[PDB]
Design a protein around this nucleic acid. Structure first.
Ligand SMILES: [Cl-]
Ligand SMILES: [Cl-]
Ligand SMILES: [Cl-]
Ligand SMILES: [Cl-]
Ligand SMILES: [Cl-]
Ligand SMILES: [Cl-]
Ligand SMILES: [Cl-]
Ligand SMILES: [Mg+2]
Ligand SMILES: [Mg+2]
Ligand SMILES: [Mg+2]
Ligand SMILES: [Mg+2]
Ligand SMILES: [Mg+2]
Ligand SMILES: [Mg+2]
Ligand SMILES: [Mg+2]
Ligand SMILES: [Mg+2]
Ligand SMILES: [Mg+2]
Ligand SMILES: [Mg+2]
Ligand SMILES: [Mg+2]
Ligand SMILES: [Mg+2]
Ligand SMILES: [Mg+2]
Ligand code: NA
Ligand code: NA
Ligand code: NA
Ligand code: NA
Ligand code: NA
Ligand code: NA
Ligand code: NA
Ligand code: NA
Ligand code: NA
Ligand code: NA
Ligand code: NA
Ligand code: NA
Ligand code: NA
Ligand code: NA
Ligand code: NA
Ligand code: NA
Ligand SMILES: [Sr+2]
Ligand SMILES: [Sr+2]
Ligand SMILES: [Sr+2]
Ligand SMILES: [Sr+2]
Ligand SMILES: [Sr+2]
Ligand SMILES: [Sr+2]
Ligand SMILES: [Sr+2]
Ligand SMILES: [Sr+2]
Ligand SMILES: [Sr+2]
Ligand SMILES: [Sr+2]
Ligand SMILES: [Sr+2]
Ligand SMILES: [Sr+2]
Ligand SMILES: [Sr+2]
Lengths: 142, 142, 150, 49
RNA sequence: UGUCCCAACGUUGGGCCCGGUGAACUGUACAUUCCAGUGCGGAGUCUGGAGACACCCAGGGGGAAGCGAAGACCCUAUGGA
RNA sequence: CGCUCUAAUUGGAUGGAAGUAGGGGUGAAAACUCCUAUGGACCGAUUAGUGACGAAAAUCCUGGCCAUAGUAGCAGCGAUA
RNA sequence: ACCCUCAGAAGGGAGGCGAAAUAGAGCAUGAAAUCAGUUGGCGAUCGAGCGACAGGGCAUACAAGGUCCCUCGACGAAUGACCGACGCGCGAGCGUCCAGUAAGACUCACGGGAAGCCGAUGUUCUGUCGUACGUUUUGAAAAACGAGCCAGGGAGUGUGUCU
């Protein structure tokens, strides 16, 4: 009578104190948008980042207000870089055999969008029984 | 037409600029101020040079316009506006909760703000807003 | 061409469309805007008065150089686009007709939806001085109308 | 010779136009021109062994 | 002898309003400006003030160092005729 | 980092591929990925190659399109109809 | 096809076919520029590189993010008190002690709370900074040059020889 998601949807990973601290930091500190200079001034100029090269570029020259320039200093903490916001490290899965070797305590699985419903169903029931959470679950009316 | 002023200042024998500076400070702090007996406010210096300056402001102008007030009423209020960022929202709000009056339309007597009083027994070189207005051609309605 | 851009419950609604009409698109926006919300019969009476010259059509957007009209309410510029108006009378005639064929009281239904869309331009060229020619085109207009029971 | 079979010429300065070779009012030959030659295309003389 | 003093009235066609038809030039962006100043020394956009309720019609063209034409002058090129 | 096609190894797709639109997540970033709608047949990953491989600009090219504008013109000619 | 409408082989409406007519004729898909209608936010007393970063308003079906807020407590870097006591200074004020104490960013735990609620997204308001971009140039916001807008197109390639 209602929609419910298959699998261990509420499952949380178990992290060392330090990893939970750094994950919390990443989430608190965040980062600037880092969109290309003046992308907002011209429709033909997209948001995708490009190093400002103009000799007189205000952003290139680092004038406060012209947006931050990509630098290694903005990198996220090594120990948490790339983790899903839940804390899980993601594993791209295309079939059932891809579930093999996956630790449901540390990793959550993400079924490629291209995978069909039939194959997803098997992958989903096989992941739940393996204790692995599926980040993009199928919602069925139960 | 009725002005619930949290403060009523008496400008009589008080240095205009010093009162103005304090009425602005208070207006920005949210106080509703009414300056009274403006025609009796005072400005120090040589009357001839003082008047020459206000006469210049009156003569300045063009199509865009430089409407400068002649009544002690407006002279004083303009003086305050120059100490307020009247073009910003908070500034216009402050300025708009301040009013100046010829004589004293209230029943209470205004209070004399510290540091703004001028001792006539110790000063001969100073003028009166009313005197300035009369020279400017204002119709002495006070 | 266009498709109705709004949903319509067939049990309480009647539809109609004009296709590729060669008339001022700018006039059509003005007319649609003005008759939306009116009853079919009112719209018709209104448009006949426009063609007759007794009722101006407010020109709120395409108004450059347009002279003011005392009868325009809440606005200044207006005109009497009789051509596009007649095209709207056809549209209304079709709508109300369909309306009645379905059992409804056509004339009494409200113009729930009416909008004009520029579907294209019939192209033309005009010789000019100095050996050159410039564009001389005709707008092509589609317009949708949805009538709805009061 | 692809894109080179045209006597297209530029009008130079004067008509408020970019100095692009044109023929029958159409730009041609140059690489930035639609229907123009390929600037650095695959070449047959290249040793692919 | 209206060239002028010194301009007036009138005529015809436009101009203005309405139906229909229906282009082009031009457009980095923003843009209600004005006075001063500053700045690559000739600013609607920077700074300080002043002024500024929105929109529309008609107008004569002060400004946009207006639009149109990669200055016809001058110089430079181990250029052309 | 991304693009094309080739090869080896290895996967996805009518139980819905690519693309597109809107939206969620990751990466300093190039960019990667998922969801929903559309779509209705193809699409990847790794590794070694291949190269007509990346655009905001050139009075750049071609196509499409907006403001200009319901604006100018549809009067002027000794043939005013 | 049939029917209705219409001056009408037009068009429109209803209807029939097909998995699909949003496959109905330059008829697979259907971007941007852009147009009509409309939803959210702003809006007829107010100022212009259009934003970046902070923080408030209002707005939000699901999915793909799940956090966030307040009492208190634990930890507690640099920094770092009030008050009180004593003692100096013409005075504003200062010294000694209290004391490197109370406090102190982040993070965590207990208890309570929020689901438009936290993130995010749209718009708008406030604060700080801010006169595009690329090029020419000693010096560009430039009254120096280029572009109306968008999409697509658009520039280190081959042979030979040398190093
Ligand atoms: Cl790195
Ligand atoms: Cl004036
Ligand atoms: Cl201000
Ligand atoms: Cl004295
Ligand atoms: Cl149009
Ligand atoms: Cl921490
Ligand atoms: Cl190179
Ligand atoms: Mg853009
Ligand atoms: Mg006019
Ligand atoms: Mg000719
Ligand atoms: Mg070619
Ligand atoms: Mg030249
Ligand atoms: Mg010469
Ligand atoms: Mg010679
Ligand atoms: Mg392999
Ligand atoms: Mg391209
Ligand atoms: Mg470039
Ligand atoms: Mg005009
Ligand atoms: Mg005659
Ligand atoms: Mg098609
Ligand atoms: Na003085
Ligand atoms: Na004046
Ligand atoms: Na308008
Ligand atoms: Na009116
Ligand atoms: Na009126
Ligand atoms: Na040819
Ligand atoms: Na060869
Ligand atoms: Na005469
Ligand atoms: Na002018
Ligand atoms: Na010669
Ligand atoms: Na051009
Ligand atoms: Na907000
Ligand atoms: Na240049
Ligand atoms: Na520049
Ligand atoms: Na300049
Ligand atoms: Na144009
Ligand atoms: Sr899919
Ligand atoms: Sr003070
Ligand atoms: Sr308009
Ligand atoms: Sr020349
Ligand atoms: Sr200013
Ligand atoms: Sr004129
Ligand atoms: Sr290329
Ligand atoms: Sr046009
Ligand atoms: Sr005639
Ligand atoms: Sr003529
Ligand atoms: Sr049908
Ligand atoms: Sr401590
Ligand atoms: Sr392009």
């Amino acid at each position: 009578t209602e929609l419910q998601a298959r699998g261990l949807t509420e499952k949380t990973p178990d992290l060392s104190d330090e990893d939970a601290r750094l994950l919390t930091q990443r989430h608190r500190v965040g980062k600037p948008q880092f969109n290309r200079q003046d992308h907002h001034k011209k429709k033909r100029v997209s948001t995708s980042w490009r190093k400002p090269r103009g000799q007189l570029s205000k952003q290139r020259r680092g004038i406060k207000g012209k947006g931050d320039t990509v630098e290694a200093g903005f990198r996220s903490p090594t120990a948490v870089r790339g983790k899903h916001p839940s804390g899980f490290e993601e594993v791209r899965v295309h079939n059932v055999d891809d579930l093999e070797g996956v630790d449901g305590d540390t990793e959550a699985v993400r079924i490629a969008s291209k995978v069909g419903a039939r194959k997803r169903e098997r992958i989903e029931e096989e992941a739940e029984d393996a204790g692995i959470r599926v980040l993009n679950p199928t919602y069925v009316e139960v | 037409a009725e002005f619930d002023a949290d403060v009523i200042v008496d400008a009589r024998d008080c240095i205009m600029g010093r009162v103005a500076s304090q009425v602005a400070e208070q207006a920005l702090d949210g106080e509703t101020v009414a300056v009274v007996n403006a025609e009796r406010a005072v400005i120090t210096g040589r009357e001839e040079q003082i008047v020459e300056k206000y006469e210049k402001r009156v003569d300045i102008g063009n199509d865009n316009g430089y409407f400068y007030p002649k009544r002690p009423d407006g002279i004083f209020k303009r003086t305050i506006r120059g100490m307020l960022p009247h073009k910003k929202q908070r500034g216009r709000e402050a300025f708009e909760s301040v009013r100046v009056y010829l004589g004293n339309p209230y029943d209470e007597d205004g209070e004399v703000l510290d540091g703004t009083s001028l001792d006539r027994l110790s000063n001969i070189k100073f003028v009166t807003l009313g005197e300035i207005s009369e020279t400017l051609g204002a119709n002495k309605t006070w | 061409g266009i498709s109705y851009s709004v949903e319509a419950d067939p049990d309480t609604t009647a539809k109609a469309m004009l296709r590729e009409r060669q008339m001022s698109f700018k006039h059509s926006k003005a007319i649609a805007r003005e008759i939306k919300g009116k009853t079919a019969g009112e719209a018709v009476d209104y448009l006949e008065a426009v063609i007759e010259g007794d009722q101006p059509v407010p020109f709120k957007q395409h108004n450059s150089g347009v002279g003011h009209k005392s009868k325009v309410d809440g606005w200044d510029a207006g005109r009497y686009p009789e051509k596009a108006s007649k095209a709207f009378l056809d549209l209304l005639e079709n709508a109300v007709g369909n309306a009645d064929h379905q059992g409804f009281d056509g004339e009494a239904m409200t113009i729930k939806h009416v909008a004009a869309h520029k579907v294209g331009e019939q192209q033309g060229r005009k010789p000019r001085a100095m050996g050159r020619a410039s564009a001389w085109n005709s707008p092509q207009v589609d317009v949708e109308l949805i009538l709805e029971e009061p | 010779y692809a894109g080179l079979r045209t006597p297209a010429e530029s009008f130079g300065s004067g008509r408020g136009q970019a100095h692009v070779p044109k023929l029958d009012g159409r730009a041609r030959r140059v690489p930035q021109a639609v229907k123009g030659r390929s600037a650095h295309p695959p070449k047959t003389e290249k040793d692919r062994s």
